[PDB]
Design an enzyme around this catalytic site. Structure first.
Site, short mmCIF file in Angstrom:
data_model
loop_
_atom_site.label_atom_id
_atom_site.label_comp_id
_atom_site.label_asym_id
_atom_site.label_seq_id
_atom_site.Cartn_x
_atom_site.Cartn_y
_atom_site.Cartn_z
N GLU A 69 12.31 18.72 21.48
CA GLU A 69 11.21 19.27 20.68
C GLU A 69 9.86 19.21 21.39
OE1 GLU A 69 11.33 17.47 16.84
OE2 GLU A 69 13.27 18.36 16.31
N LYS A 128 14.55 23.23 5.36
CA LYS A 128 15.25 23.85 6.49
C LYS A 128 16.12 25.01 6.02
CE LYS A 128 15.53 19.73 9.47
NZ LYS A 128 16.39 18.58 9.86
CL CL Z 1 11.00 15.78 21.95
MG MG Z 2 14.85 14.74 10.07
#
Ligand code: CL
Ligand code: MG
Ligand code: MG
Lengths: 397, 400
Positions: free
Chosen positions: B200, B311
């Site tokens: 990420e 999500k």
């Molecule tokens: Cl990350």
């Molecule tokens: Mg999570």
């Protein structure tokens, strides 16, 4: 006719500010383009204009270049036909008035240059590659993927699926090999975190062994299925026989900047010895500049050029570099910068020019993957009219 | 009316196959969406359908999900009005016939669901956030940015985040985050740590330590810990399955939010956690709720958590996702629209979070275009809104 032009400041893949531009046409055409940014810029690259305000992004803001688009460039270009790419580019070049685009900024100029081509393709109802290259744009590039980085002197260690029969297969072979490499590094207690281009930087000859092992583990033949390329970028730590040993020892197909960006005499010597064995790519040596490439061709220096849009500043001058290279029997490797964006123009550009090779990163990070995705979309659209050359991309050999 | 639907296999940010779908309309509208994929998927998420052909991507292909779109789904959805989102989604839900979308795949279904909404926005001449949320879509989210990780080290917590609660605009929030990220980078460089990044875009150097490092990076960047930039974290406790301990971290550091501090199936543990900490910190259910109204309902009734991580691909349709968000709001819960660790060039969550005025987003660190593309889109959205935009910062936390 272009009716409006607008720029804004956005972020690249390193979290650094860069320029984005949009072009609007009378017929309702729309194009949006983002300019990438290098970290290892050659000293003769076109001028990337930064604000230098230490209170914003450590002085890396591009509000000035953005305002140069919204003001001067907008006034000079609005009213021109969107399909007149050469006129649009030369207009901006004249407006700047400096050889290296230092007044307005190459990043300001390129943003408009690319957004214009995109708006043109949009209003014509054509995909970008079709608009840029015409009816015979059909060759999908053999990609070199930067999976191991450099501690280590050589900067990029790449795998290149020369044995694939389609771009789709090339991408799958690269991905499978990348994830095999990842597992291999995990066994040896190395980190699987990635550098700027999506590859690994574990702790000069060792990466060649690692690549060959990873290729073999993924079930592919080193050399025939997947070959090796590397970028020394020797300007950063400034010999021919050591390189040649690596070349003869390992299945190497391409070597980039094996000598300093200003060592013209040494390059000619290098090319004499190795020009028959391997592709020799000038990056910092040529900086996507026809004046530099012309010199190299006359001297018999290198046999390939790394094509970087923002090194020169306009799409037109980039077309000119690519075509000059071709006519000299040089390959033109269309390239990303280490600071990339969600823009996928180079994918369409490399198919448009049938260049045959691309350097757009490892098999991770969307800043690289988005390019591979677009290439796959292009291959699908082409269908039976598509062509992937693999090892046959190397007409310079 | 939708006239054509086409899907293809593309690659995510980790180089793993995922589904992309396109929707064409009679008026010439066009929409294209890509489905993200999690690494730490909760056990109750809707089914991500994989091929299992180990001669392709080690079995990670999604050709079946793609063929499910191109065949069955296309035949069921083509001819439906593109603006009829709820009908389009329900048609696909019924077509699949299973509660977890395990027949056609949630990745197949979501790809069409989102591409439909985009094609609808396109034919109406509307920006996505405007179409999705209507004339009062205007609130830009306070972003929590995953700059340090712990999901291969002596740290059990999975995500360590900074959150510009003191910013006055999204543009400022982004700049504060990026400046702090780059300050953090120099700090790790000083300590001989690596500057390579995880999935990420955050750093993974080698439980209290990341909080101290974050506080220092914030200060060195010239911002105030707490007032200007606060800390949020995601333990993802399930991936390695205590309240007083958590309460030590919360009381010791300027923490505004904690996510999945307990196991995904420990409802009683969660309940007493919320009893202790619910008054002074946001408590986010991620794997606990899996963007599922049935799970959120149980949480609300039991007094569990005060926030839900939203999500899209955890549930499989945009409609069911809207329903989770609205149910959360009506309960006084915040809805944090979220990416997955495996992201793409798709930026739908940016338009989604503004459309619903959710107030918070979780879309990654300040590197990797898989994260940055969302921040860029949010900035485009803020500029478009102009004077009509609103950034709430600390005021996004109506649950507190
Ligand atoms: Cl990350
Ligand atoms: Mg999570
Ligand atoms: Mg180079």
């Amino acid at each position: 006719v272009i009716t409006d032009i607008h720029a804004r400041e956005v972020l690249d893949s390193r979290g650094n500010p860069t320029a984005e531009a949009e072009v609007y046409t009378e017929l309702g055409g729309f194009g949006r383009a983002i300019v990438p940014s290098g970290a290892s810029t050659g000293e003769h690259e076109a001028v990337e204009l930064r604000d230098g305000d230490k209170s914003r992004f450590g002085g890396q803001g591009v509000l000035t270049a953005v305002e140069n688009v919204n003001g001067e460039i907008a006034k000079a270009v609005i009213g021109l036909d969107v399909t007149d790419q050469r006129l649009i580019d030369q207009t901006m070049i004249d407006l700047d008035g400096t050889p290296n685009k230092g007044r307005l900024g190459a990043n300001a100029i390129l943003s408009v240059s690319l957004a214009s081509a995109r708006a043109a393709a949009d209003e014509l109802g054509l995909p970008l590659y079709e608009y840029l290259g015409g009816p015979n744009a059909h060759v999908l590039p053999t990609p070199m993927m930067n999976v191991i980085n450099g501690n280590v002197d050589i900067q990029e260690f790449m795998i290149m699926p020369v044995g694939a029969k389609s771009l789709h297969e090339a991408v799958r072979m690269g991905a499978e090999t990348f994830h095999t490499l990842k597992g291999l590094l995990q066994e040896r207690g190395e980190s699987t975190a990635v550098g700027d281009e999506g590859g690994f930087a574990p702790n000069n000859e060792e990466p060649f062994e690692i690549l060959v092992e990873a290729i073999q583990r993924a079930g592919y033949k080193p050399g025939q299925d997947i070959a090796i390329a590397f970028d020394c970028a020797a300007s950063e730590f400034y010999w021919t026989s050591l390189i040649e040993d690596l070349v003869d020892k390992y299945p190497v197909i391409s070597v980039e900047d094996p000598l300093d960006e200003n060592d013209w005499e040494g390059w000619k010597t290098f090319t004499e010895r190795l020009g028959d064995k391997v592709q020799i790519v000038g990056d910092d040596l040529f900086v996507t500049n026809t004046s530099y490439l012309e010199k190299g061709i006359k001297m018999g220096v290198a046999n390939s050029i790394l094509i970087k849009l923002n090194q020169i500043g306009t799409l037109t001058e980039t077309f000119e570099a690519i075509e000059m290279a071709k006519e000299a029997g040089y390959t033109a490797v269309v390239s990303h910068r280490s600071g990339e964006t969600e823009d996928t123009t180079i994918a369409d550009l490399v198919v448009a020019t049938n260049a045959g090779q691309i350097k757009t990163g490892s098999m991770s990070r969307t800043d690289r993957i988005a390019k591979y995705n677009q290439l796959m979309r292009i291959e699908e659209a082409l269908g039976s009219t598509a062509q992937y050359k693999g090892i046959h991309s190397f007409y310079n050999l």
